[PDB]
Amino acid sequence: SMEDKQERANYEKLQQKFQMLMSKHQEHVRPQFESLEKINKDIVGWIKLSGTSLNYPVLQGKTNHDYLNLDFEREHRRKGSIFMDFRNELKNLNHNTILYGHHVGDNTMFDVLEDYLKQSFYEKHKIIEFDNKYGKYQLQVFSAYKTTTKDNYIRTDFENDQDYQQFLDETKRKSVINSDVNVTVKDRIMTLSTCEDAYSETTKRIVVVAKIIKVS
């Protein structure tokens, strides 16, 4: 209750601040993030799916565990943050940008990814909003599947187009959902993956892959 309600309140407050910032800077996006960086310089983006609980800042540390158990204000929270892989850049995007988040089943963080394993849900939520200092983007979902940690869906960059094409085709092959989105080697992708606590018994992960489109 003290954790829960307070945590929830703080997210509501930040969500509201970001919606105000968006409405204020109608064309731009850099001022919105410069403002959010005052709270935490590690806030690199924002992810939002309308009608769902996915409406969070995106953190990035030096490692993939910096924000595993820490929130946007660097406070200890079991559910931590939605965070980007430490290897990824935002100025000039890598071929595959990876975001991680908890899935504890209380309809928060990346609990939503589990819903994408259903065709009906996918059809009603094909586009996810992603914003950063460099632009406003759409995440055009094309693949959703459950895997293990024995499978590398985490690949950030490729040796050539053939390697990248292999990856894209494998991604579509693994998909539990049918999509009309066309993804080529000239495109950049975003991987959304569930993230478990350190040294957890659970090896299963839910992965949602999307094509990045710049809307700004």
Binding site: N64, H65, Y100, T149, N152, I154, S193, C195, E196, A198
Partner: peptide, 4 residues
């Protein structure tokens, strides 16, 4: 494998 990194932390996922």
């Amino acid at each position: 494998n990194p932390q996922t």
